[PDB]
Design an enzyme around this catalytic site. Structure first.
Site, mmCIF file in Angstrom:
data_model
loop_
_atom_site.group_PDB
_atom_site.id
_atom_site.type_symbol
_atom_site.label_atom_id
_atom_site.label_comp_id
_atom_site.label_asym_id
_atom_site.label_seq_id
_atom_site.Cartn_x
_atom_site.Cartn_y
_atom_site.Cartn_z
ATOM 1 N N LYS A 109 0.812 -1.224 0.000
ATOM 2 C CA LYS A 109 0.000 0.000 0.000
ATOM 3 C C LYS A 109 0.851 1.282 0.000
ATOM 4 C CE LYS A 109 -3.920 0.412 -0.052
ATOM 5 N NZ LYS A 109 -4.717 0.630 -1.292
ATOM 6 N N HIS A 163 -2.265 8.883 -10.428
ATOM 7 C CA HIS A 163 -3.544 8.371 -9.964
ATOM 8 C C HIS A 163 -4.044 9.125 -8.728
ATOM 9 C CE1 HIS A 163 -6.783 5.614 -9.215
ATOM 10 N NE2 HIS A 163 -6.357 4.723 -10.093
ATOM 11 N N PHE A 389 -36.665 4.634 -38.443
ATOM 12 C CA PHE A 389 -35.787 4.256 -39.561
ATOM 13 C C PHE A 389 -36.510 3.983 -40.874
ATOM 14 C CE2 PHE A 389 -34.065 2.761 -35.528
ATOM 15 C CZ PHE A 389 -32.930 3.527 -35.465
ATOM 16 N N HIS A 630 -20.384 -4.552 -30.837
ATOM 17 C CA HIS A 630 -21.375 -5.571 -31.126
ATOM 18 C C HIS A 630 -21.152 -6.759 -30.244
ATOM 19 C CE1 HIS A 630 -22.555 -3.341 -34.682
ATOM 20 N NE2 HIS A 630 -21.295 -3.324 -35.078
ATOM 21 N N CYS A 673 -27.736 -8.908 -32.253
ATOM 22 C CA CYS A 673 -26.817 -8.099 -31.479
ATOM 23 C C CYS A 673 -27.516 -7.743 -30.165
ATOM 24 C CB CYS A 673 -26.409 -6.843 -32.245
ATOM 25 S SG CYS A 673 -25.117 -5.916 -31.409
ATOM 26 N N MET A 683 -30.997 -4.746 -35.405
ATOM 27 C CA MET A 683 -29.857 -5.649 -35.656
ATOM 28 C C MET A 683 -30.172 -7.032 -35.081
ATOM 29 S SD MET A 683 -25.732 -4.837 -35.076
ATOM 30 C CE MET A 683 -25.783 -3.244 -35.915
ATOM 31 N N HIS A 966 -10.228 -3.302 -14.262
ATOM 32 C CA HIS A 966 -8.874 -3.279 -13.723
ATOM 33 C C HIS A 966 -8.856 -3.503 -12.214
ATOM 34 C CE1 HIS A 966 -4.847 -2.270 -12.741
ATOM 35 N NE2 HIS A 966 -5.102 -1.038 -12.331
HETATM 36 CA CA LIG Z 1 -0.808 4.309 -0.787
HETATM 37 CU CU LIG Z 2 -24.386 -4.372 -32.564
HETATM 38 CU CU LIG Z 3 -3.963 0.325 -11.410
HETATM 39 CU CU LIG Z 4 -7.050 2.818 -10.778
HETATM 40 CU CU LIG Z 5 -4.298 2.425 -14.899
HETATM 41 NA NA NA Z 6 -34.000 5.449 -43.092
HETATM 42 O O LIG Z 7 -2.750 -1.082 -10.541
#
Ligand SMILES: [Ca+2]
Ligand SMILES: [Cu+2]
Ligand SMILES: [Cu+2]
Ligand SMILES: [Cu+2]
Ligand SMILES: [Cu+2]
Ligand code: NA
Ligand SMILES: [O]
Ligand SMILES: *C1O[C@H](CO)[C@@H](O)[C@H](O)[C@H]1NC(C)=O
Ligand SMILES: *[C@@H]1O[C@H](CO)[C@@H](O)[C@H](O)[C@H]1NC(C)=O
Ligand SMILES: [Cu+2]
Ligand SMILES: [Cu+2]
Ligand SMILES: [Cu+2]
Ligand code: NA
Ligand code: NA
Length: 1029
Positions: A109, A163, A389, A630, A673, A683, A966
């Site tokens: 940390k 960050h 459409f 898609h 889709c 679609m 992430h």
């Molecule tokens: Ca820290």
């Molecule tokens: Cu699509």
């Molecule tokens: Cu990160």
């Molecule tokens: Cu982050």
């Molecule tokens: Cu990052």
């Molecule tokens: Na159209």
């Molecule tokens: O990270």
């Protein structure tokens, strides 16, 4: 190895387009560069104040180690190898606080360099706000857990950036590469047996978000008082579509020798507009030993490719996102003769496939029947979604457009056609299949019968410079680049082993061709076609694959008729009042956005038929812009792709995929889709699987049987039960602090909404809900985590306790029939989900894979109203503790809920003041949540050092639901046996994925989507790793 780097943050001017000159780019017309690049009284131009990372020699930050010219503004390349201890000595020589936060490497940390509420104290918080003049040394360990996979290269792309407010810090310029490598990969900071290493960031670098926006407006604008920071055109002018910070073809110094072994480290960075399609013209790459040519990148996508440079000359690295292409996201690279040495193939002339294709104008009806085949409703029904459409009148074209399409002929005379058979009926707007094997030579006699200059530009095959179908450069009669309205050129392409499938690939690979005179208009006009490049001796003489009953080509795209060369013509031909038409009206533009599959809409695509048992190969590809996110869902069947079991295929601009399916149930199913706007906009199509053998008295294998009692129940859902984590974050950030989504203000709804959700009950009386345990606290809005084993028959006893019809149904699963019966309010129905082998792991999947369960009655609105859960299917009949978490990344668009009116009435302090069509009110209801929770309100993600954690990531939603997941503090591994590793996983609608994690480091760690707009919108939480005993 202890390595020590010295990085300092200085403020300095960056030139986005360092001329010098002077260029021609694909689809950028000379006098256009200056929308982004020209200094005016109103416009910053090409020069900006930025905070950048530079490298130094010394703890005395004084003399800088120069960085490659091609890096642009990215910070210096840091590298490490499994075992290494990196010390990044940071020194802030800028005017505001910043950090150094690294991806893909272990830290405590104290060394994360990211500020957020983690219950840390001062010792572990110095890293998180390094003030001007301060200095902090980050200790990073390259642990085994973070290292490249078995199935990975020797080195993988990672990144570092500041960050505090990451999106803003990164926009300001604080982003750089970390390359992480396996143990003895490197010799003097370079990979053994590799000749060149380049790093390339694709990003719409948004200077609107920079800390220096204001400083820059003072410096460069003559009339600062006159600048409105919210003017859309002002905002666009600060969006610098670049690779490594270089805009409009100015990236300098990408140079290599033919036969150089080049390893390219790519990553995307930014926001919802950062749908990138990185494409190296004239060259051929592998990724994880697979042949690829387009590399799709999104905010924080990490990606590595290998290229043996060949086919010498001046080539483009472009983003094939048509908006990015025309906004100039292009970079030149050079393959020189020096002199080689090798060559290897050879074949240029021997076995010749010859095609005769002509561009010619037809009138294409996107929906011939005039009906929606799914609902039987007809397309001009007033007030219908299709009406937008297909409505034809005063200022509205309707459903038929003049287009320019490719069509095949028998020989050079172009006197008579190669008619289409049954096998070709589904191609629709697509041109003819071009196919070839490794070793062939393709010659294509292209004859333009259209009023505009066109070409043919293939993806997937090798060609030389004067056979290239598009024109670009750094400096009567017809050519490869230009084939004018009556002319005729004959292309020559080669397909050497270097450009075809690899050992790991399947026998054939989906590819495509299009007109690239101006591909940002030509494709949408209709000049797109399917192609199929295969291994040696894999096709029969007729083109068909050996042991393959059916071959289909699907091209899903928003056909943007506003960008067709033939727009004016279609206005003049179809509107009642041509003179009353404003090409810039948004509602007019929507009416021309034809969301289609092979040019067909609302289930009107014919010719997708097959027998049960058949071997079917689907070739899918797409083109377009950021709207083309898609997820092509084959309801009722799964497919294998690179040894993975899936049922929904994600395509972006110039994506190509090859799926193998063996349909096992008689019926008429959906290829559609799932991207909610695309679905609603038509679609969607049907495919029929017929019963072609004798039925046989079957079902003689049920290793298991399970019953679950589930109910749809209406509830008050709070996206943010508390707001403490949020208040703390913005305080730490020094920010302030309108929340558009949670702040009720004068008359908005806030964080609480009536929703309908799936909940588990103990038995058929539905009197007693199953108690949610500690380990399922994290499920949040999600229904219960249902488990099934391959071999199970799973009974779902479903009671609709809500006030309208809903259903429950699962991806991946097999059922008796193509139709799913709605269950009415108060009613209880039984649904049976069988789990055959093909509902579980492929060869190359983890033992357990997730599928989304969901409601089919109205898939868009039922989903956004809250009905969504995870089904986990598992293989097979001392070690560590094993945990499971399921995570839905979904912007809950509460504007689309069935309960919207109820909610306006219940929560608004002034219901009358709400306009449902007002943009601001619409944003206020877009809840950017993980599992229905925002700003750290997703609780219960707790685990111990030593555990094995399966993370089941699930994505659904709309065009903007591209989520780049992430995990701070730890990376993950994926696929059978953990053979690919990363710390950012890309999730889109339909994407369901197991990621294995082996947590080491104690702490409370941030887990968030890495898209700017989504982070700020609150799509984030923390997870807790506890130490032992
Ligand atoms: Ca820290
Ligand atoms: Cu699509
Ligand atoms: Cu990160
Ligand atoms: Cu982050
Ligand atoms: Cu990052
Ligand atoms: Na159209
Ligand atoms: O990270
Ligand atoms: C369906 O009904 C519409 C309603 O206005 C009608 O005008 C149209 O002819 C019908 N569409 C077709 C082609 O079946
Ligand atoms: C942070 O500390 C508070 C107060 O002691 C505690 O109740 C809470 O559990 C902690 N938060 C996390 C994310 O563990
Ligand atoms: Cu792009
Ligand atoms: Cu996201
Ligand atoms: Cu948003
Ligand atoms: Na600018
Ligand atoms: Na809200």
């Amino acid at each position: 190895k202890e390595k020590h780097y010295y990085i300092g943050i200085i403020e300095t001017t960056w030139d986005y387009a360092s001329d010098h000159g002077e260029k021609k780019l694909i689809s950028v017309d000379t006098e256009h560069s200056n929308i982004y690049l020209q200094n005016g009284p109103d416009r910053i131009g090409r020069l900006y104040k930025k905070a950048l990372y530079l490298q130094y020699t010394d703890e005395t930050f004084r003399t800088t180690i120069e960085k490659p010219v091609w890096l642009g503004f990215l910070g210096p390349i840091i590298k490490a190898e499994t075992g290494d201890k990196v010390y990044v000595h940071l020194k802030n020589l800028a005017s505001r606080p910043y950090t150094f936060h690294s991806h893909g490497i272990t830290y405590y940390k104290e060394h994360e360099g990211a500020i957020y509420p983690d219950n840390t104290t001062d010792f572990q918080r110095a890293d998180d706000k390094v003030y001007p003049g301060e200095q902090y040394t980050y200790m990073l360990l390259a642990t085994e857990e973070q290292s490249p996979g078995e199935g990975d290269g020797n080195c993988v792309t990672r990144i570092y950036h500041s960050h505090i407010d990451a999106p803003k810090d990164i926009a300001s310029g604080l982003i750089g590469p970390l390359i992480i490598c396996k143990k003895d990969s490197l010799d003097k900071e370079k990979e053994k047996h590799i000749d060149r290493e380049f790093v390339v960031m694709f990003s719409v670098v948004d200077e609107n978000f920079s800390w220096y926006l204001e400083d820059n407006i003072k410096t460069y604008c003559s009339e600062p008082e006159k600048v409105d920071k919210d003017n859309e055109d002002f905002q666009q002018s600060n969006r610098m579509y670049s690779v490594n910070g270089y805009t409009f073809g100015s990236l300098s110094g990408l140079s290599m020798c033919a036969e150089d072994r080049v390893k390219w480290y790519l990553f995307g960075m930014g926001n919802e507009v950062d749908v990138h399609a990185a494409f190296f013209h004239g060259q051929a790459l592998t990724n994880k030993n697979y042949r690829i040519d387009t590399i799709n990148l999104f905010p924080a996508t990490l990606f590595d490719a290998y290229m043996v440079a060949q086919n010498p000359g001046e080539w483009m690295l472009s983003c094939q996102n048509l908006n990015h292409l025309k906004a100039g996201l292009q970079a030149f690279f050079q393959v020189q003769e020096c002199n080689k040495s090798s060559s290897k193939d050879n074949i240029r002339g021997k076995h010749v496939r010859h095609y005769y294709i002509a561009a010619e104008e037809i009138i294409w009806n996107y929906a011939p029947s005039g009906i929606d085949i799914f609902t039987k409703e007809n397309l001009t029904a007033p007030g219908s979604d299709s009406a937008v459409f297909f409505e034809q009148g005063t200022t509205r074209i309707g459903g038929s457009y003049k287009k320019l399409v490719y069509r095949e002929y028998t020989d050079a005379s172009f006197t008579n056609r190669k008619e289409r058979g049954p096998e070709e009926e589904h191609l629709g707007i697509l041109g003819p299949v071009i196919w070839a094997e490794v070793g062939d030579t393709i010659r294509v006699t292209f004859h333009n019968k259209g009023a505009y200059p066109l070409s043919i530009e293939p993806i997937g095959v090798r060609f030389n410079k004067n056979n290239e179908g598009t024109y670009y450069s750094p400096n009567v009669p017809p050519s490869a680049s230009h084939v004018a309205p009556t002319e005729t050129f004959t292309y020559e392409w080669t397909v050497p082993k270097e450009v075809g499938p690899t050992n790991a690939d399947p026998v054939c690979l989906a590819k495509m061709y299009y007109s690239a005179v101006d591909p940002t208009k030509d494709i949408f006009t209709g000049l797109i076609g399917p192609m199929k490049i295969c291994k040696k001796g894999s096709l029969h003489a007729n083109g068909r694959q050996k042991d393959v009953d059916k071959e289909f080509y699907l091209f899903p795209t928003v056909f943007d008729e506003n960008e067709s060369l033939l727009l004016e013509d279609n206005i003049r031909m179809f509107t009642t009042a041509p003179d009353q038409v404003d090409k810039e009206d948004e509602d007019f533009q929507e009416s021309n956005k034809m969301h289609s599959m092979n040019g067909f809409m609302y289930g009107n695509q014919p010719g997708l038929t097959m027998c049960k048992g058949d071997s079917v190969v689907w070739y899918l590809f797409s083109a377009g812009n950021e709207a083309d996110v898609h997820g092509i869902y084959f309801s009722g069947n799964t497919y294998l792709w690179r040894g993975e079991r899936r049922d929904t295929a994600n395509l972006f601009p110039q994506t190509s995929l090859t799926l193998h399916m063996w349909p096992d149930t008689e019926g008429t199913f959906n290829v559609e889709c799932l991207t909610t706007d695309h679905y609603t906009g038509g679609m969607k199509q049907k495919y029929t699987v017929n019963q072609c053998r004798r039925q046989s008295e079957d079902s003689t294998f049920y290793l298991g049987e399970r019953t679950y009692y589930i109910a749809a129940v209406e509830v008050e859902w709070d996206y943010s039960p508390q707001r403490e984590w949020e208040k703390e974050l913005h305080h730490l950030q020094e920010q302030n602090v309108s929340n558009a989504f949670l702040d009720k203000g004068e008359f908005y709804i806030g964080s609480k909404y009536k929703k309908v959700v799936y909940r588990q009950y103990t038995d058929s009386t539905f009197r007693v809900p199953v108690e949610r345990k500690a380990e399922e606290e994290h499920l949040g809005i999600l229904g219960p985590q249902l488990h099934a084993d391959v071999g199970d028959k799973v009974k779902i006893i479903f009671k609709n306790m809500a006030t309208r019809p809903y259903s429950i149904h699962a991806h991946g699963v097999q059922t008796e029939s193509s139709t799913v019966t709605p269950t009415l309010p108060g009613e209880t129905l039984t649904y049976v989900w069988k789990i055959p082998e093909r509902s579980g792991a492929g060869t190359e999947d983890s033992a357990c894979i997730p599928w989304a369960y969901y409601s089919t009655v109205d898939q868009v609105k039922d989903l956004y109203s809250g009905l969504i859960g995870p089904l986990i299917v598992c293989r097979r009949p001392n070690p560590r503790r094993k945990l499971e978490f399921a995570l839905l990344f979904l912007v809950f668009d509460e504007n689309e809920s069935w309960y919207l009116d109820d909610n306006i009435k219940t929560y608004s302090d002034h219901p009358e003041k709400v306009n449902k069509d007002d943009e601001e009110f619409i944003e206020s209801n877009k809840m950017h949540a993980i599992n229905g929770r925002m700003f750290g309100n997703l609780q219960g993600l707790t685990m111990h050092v030593g555990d094995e954690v399966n993370w089941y990531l699930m994505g659904m939603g709309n065009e903007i639901d591209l989520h780049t997941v992430h995990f701070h503090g730890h990376s993950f591994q994926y696929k059978h046996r953990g053979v690919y590793s990363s710390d950012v996983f890309d999730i889109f609608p339909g994407t369901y994925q197991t990621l294995e994690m082996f947590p080491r480091t104690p702490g409370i760690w941030l887990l968030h989507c890495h898209v700017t707009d989504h982070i700020h919108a609150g799509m984030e939480t923390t997870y807790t790793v506890l130490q032992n005993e």
